[PDB]
Amino acid sequence: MVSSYFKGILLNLGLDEERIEVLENKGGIVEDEFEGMRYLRLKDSARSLRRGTVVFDEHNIILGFPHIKRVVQLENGIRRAFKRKPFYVEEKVDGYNVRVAKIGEKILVFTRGGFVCPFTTERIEDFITLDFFKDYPNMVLCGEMAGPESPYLVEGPPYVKEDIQFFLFDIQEKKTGRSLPVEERLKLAEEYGIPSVEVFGLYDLSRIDELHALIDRLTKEKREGIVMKSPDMKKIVGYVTPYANINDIKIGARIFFDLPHGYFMQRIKRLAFYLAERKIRGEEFDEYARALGKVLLEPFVESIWDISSGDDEIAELFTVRVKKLETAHKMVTHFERLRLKIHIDDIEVLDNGYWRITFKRVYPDATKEMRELWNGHAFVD
Amino acid sequence: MVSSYFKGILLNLGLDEERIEVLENKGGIVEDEFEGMRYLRLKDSARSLRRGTVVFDEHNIILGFPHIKRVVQLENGIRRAFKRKPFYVEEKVDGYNVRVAKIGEKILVFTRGGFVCPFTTERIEDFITLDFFKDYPNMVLCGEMAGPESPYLVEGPPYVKEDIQFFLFDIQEKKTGRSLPVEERLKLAEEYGIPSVEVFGLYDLSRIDELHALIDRLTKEKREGIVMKSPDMKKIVGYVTPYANINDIKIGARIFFDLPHGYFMQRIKRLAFYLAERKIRGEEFDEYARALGKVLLEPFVESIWDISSGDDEIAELFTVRVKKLETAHKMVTHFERLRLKIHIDDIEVLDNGYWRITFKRVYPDATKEMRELWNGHAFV
Ligand SMILES: [Mg+2]
Ligand SMILES: [Mg+2]
Ligand SMILES: [Mg+2]
Ligand SMILES: [Mg+2]
Structure with a gap:
């Protein structure tokens, strides 16, 4: 199912042959390909390899992104996580996660699950410059794609008026997944002009009332919340607005x-x-x-x-901007691999030459359950 | 371990030795005993033997109650279930389910899971007369225990001002579980003075607007809703108020x-x-x-x-009336068997000689999760 080449790399990463077999049989590891480039994707987590890790060769290993833990009680959540030590407070941007890395001569963009996103990969150069990867080819740019025209969300930050934007929130090393300290990350982002999440500043437990006021402002501004990070990036906790x-x-x-x-x-x-x-x-x-x-x-x-009142299915309509019409059809194929029932509903060329694609996603299972209940189907629950 | 005696009865009731083996190992069938009377309880369903079925011998088999299906859309639910044929509309009473049967010389009351309820069995003669079982010893009275002083609920019907009451909604045959037709059940209930759920009458799809008006009245009166039953009791569907x-x-x-x-x-x-x-x-x-x-x-x-603001656990307080103090302690033992963390919080003797017991149930698992989240525990 997976080649001995990739299995060899996993063994070097300290994964035992027995578990490698279990993952192969269960489908936890699967081979995929983008524009002729073969790679292994970790559908399930395995030892130091989190879900979403992708493996192209011994060096090009992009670790999956860690699940960020949230607190529901801000003051006590801060005390438990950081006590009275300082932490950076960044805006939590409501979009979708991407990892950007240079593999060979290509700049590939991976979504949370480890798939190469055809939309974000086609347009990455609209959001960032490739100068960073000339100097740091072994580093991975981690950020949020957010805006009103997103392939994966129907909401976004209010200050993005059109299209979509990249917001850097981490820079990680290949293979290790080690995150650069906050200050070094922000210095690199400024040096190379990489757009960043807003950093509200350095806070601590003693300033909890200022943080409450920040949450209140973000709530009125329709923003998602904050992510709090120790300067060494070892302790990270999120908190979302009402x-x-x-x-x-x-x-x-x-x-x-x-x-x-x-x-x-x-x-x-x-x-x-x-x-x-x-x-x-x-x-x-x-x-x-x-x-x-x-x-x-x-x-x-x-x-x-x-x-x-009709035989139509529950649906969501969303738009994106692509450079080439063919990219829209690549997205439809990709949506199907993700088991999303999406088709092109409308197209228009914009004054700048970009194609505004309107996708329609339907929800047949939810539609069927809702319609059955409306038509009097009786259930024990 | 279940005896070959009960295994034999299950075998004649059409269960294969293999399935009996899986049920014993998995615990789907378990032996229990009440006042010296041994019986088998079906913790899990098996073929024609629903969960809550109890087996004392070859004849004294009390079938578990069927799960009643509900509709969320009343008009289309009626059309799908009954088309335009008539159906009885009974009040759905918010309480707990009981099956009352005569086993030997004893009148036992079983809850949904198949346990003999020590509380309801002690006081069954306060709610019903036993004349019915003199004439129909092979029949099972099925009803709802509901009121403001309930061992298993903290809510109830508004027209019950104190203590608890029985509301008959079915009469079933032992072993077969066959339900008597509605008319015959109501005739027996009047004949033997068995208190009944309110029967609002015979309706059909063409009278949907009257049924909507009924739902609106029941909602304003703080009542749970209705159960619709074909006259032959073969088609039953419930609908609950907002x-x-x-x-x-x-x-x-x-x-x-x-x-x-x-x-x-x-x-x-x-x-x-x-x-x-x-x-x-x-x-x-x-x-x-x-x-x-x-x-x-x-x-x-x-x-x-x-x-x-304190180290106390989330709790519910509820009261019941018992005849003897010892029944309260039997209830605590039974509550523990049900994995419910309940103890006696208060006692008072009433002017009629009954003991008003105040039980307190605590929720340690929910308390721990709620307090951890309050204290800043972070989770994915
Ligand atoms: Mg959101
Ligand atoms: Mg998010
Ligand atoms: Mg209720
Ligand atoms: Mg009920």
């Missing part, structure tokens, strides 16, 4: 069914702990309770009306 | 963690389909949106404040 949790529910409630397990429950929990920590009461509490009920029910009810 | 769905969320939100999967999503789903079917909009919709947000967050936030 807006992020509420808007997340609103977007998901249009589909409701067949979403990741606990999707809505997790956001309700984060709202409750925010209301408790900040001791929100009275009318301000009622606004949050009304807002929560609205985003849970209104999009859900509207979709029920949609599936009741 | 009040019941909202109040269920309110009760669960105090604990939030470690509850049955989808508990809150199912109730939100039922609310949304009610708002869609009834075309509710404007202020009426906003009232429901506000109520949903309130019952999700207010009890949750209040419990967070509880676990933040």
Whole structure:
């Protein structure tokens, strides 16, 4: 299933032949290819190789990105993670994760799962310069692709008025995955003009009230929240605004069914702990309770009306800008590999020569469950 | 270990020796005993033997109750289930399920899981007369125990002002589990004075607007909803009020963690389909949106404040009335068998000689998760 060439590299990475066989049989490791370049993708985690790790050769190993842990109680979350020591506070940008690296003569962009994204790879030079990889060919640029025209999200930061942007939040070494310290990363980002997430500054537990005021500002500005990082990047914790949790529910409630397990429950929990920590009461509490009920029910009810009055499926419409028409068809093929039911709904050439592609994603399973329930199907749950 | 005696009975009931072996090893069948009477309880379902079935001998087989299917869209649910044929509409009473049968010379009361309830068995003669079992010893009375003083619930019907009551909703035959037709069941209930669920009457799809008006009344009266049954009892479907769905969320939100999967999503789903079917909009919709947000967050936030300001566990307090003090201690032992962390919090003798027992149930797992999150524990 996977070649002895790749298996040899895994053994060098300290992975035992027995586990290598188990991963091969279970499909935890799979061979893939982009523009003729063969690589191994880790669908599942294995020892020092996190999920999303990709292996092109002995040197070109791009470690998967670590899962960032979140706190729901900010003050006590800071104390447990950092005590009273300083930490950097960066904006948590609502987009999708990418790792950018130079493999051979090519600049490849990998999504969380380890797939080469045809959209972001085609357009990476619109967001960053390749000078960095001339001097640091063994380093991986880690950032968030976010904007109103995204292939993977229907929301984004408010200050991005069109298209999509790259926001660097880490620089990691190949093979080791070692993250550069924050100061060194920011120095490199400035030196090479790599766009960065906003760094609000250096904080500590003693400034918790300023951090609460920051969260309140970000909430009013419709931004997702913050990621707190020790200067050596060894301790990282995220915290999301009530807006992020509420808007997340609103977007998901249009589909409701067949979403990741606990999707809505997790956001309700984060709202409750925010209301408790900040001791929100009275009318301000009622606004949050009304807002929560609205985003849970209104999009859900509207979709029920949609599936009741016609045979159309629940859908999301989103647009991206590509340089070449052929890239849009590459994206459709890629969406299918990701098991996403997406087709091209509309096309228009922009005044700058770019193609604005409007994709339509449908949700047949959620549509089927919703329509069955509307038509009186009886269930024990 | 289950005896060859019970294995033999299961064998005649059509279970293969292999399946019996898997059930014994996995624990799907387990031996139990009440006041010296040994029986087999089906912790898991097996072919024609549903979960909660109990087997005392070849004849005294009390079949587990079928899971009742619900509809979330009333009009289309009726059409799919009954088309335009008539069906009885009974009140769905919010309590706990019991099966009452005569085994030997004893009247035993079994809960859904197949346990003999020491509480309900002690007081069964307070709720029903035993004349029925003199004439129909092979029949099983199926009903709901509901009231403000319940061992298993903290909510109940509004018209029960104290203690607890039995509400008959089925009469089933031993071994076969066959349900008597609705008319025959109601005739027996009147004949023997067995208290019954309220039967609102015979309806059909053409009277959907009257049924909607019924739901609106039941909701305003804080009642759970309806169960629709074909006259031959072969087709049964339940439909729950928006009040019941909202109040269920309110009760669960105090604990939030470690509850049955989808508990809150199912109730939100039922609310949304009610708002869609009834075309509710404007202020009426906003009232429901506000109520949903309130019952999700207010009890949750209040419990967070509880676990933040002290080392106490999330708890529920509930009361029952028993005849003898020893029954309260039997209930504690039974509660532990059910893996429920309950102890006696308060006792008081009532003017009628009954003991009012106040039980306290704590939720250590939910308390630990809630407090950890409050104290800044970080998770993916
Ligand atoms: Mg994100
Ligand atoms: Mg979001
Ligand atoms: Mg019930
Ligand atoms: Mg209830």
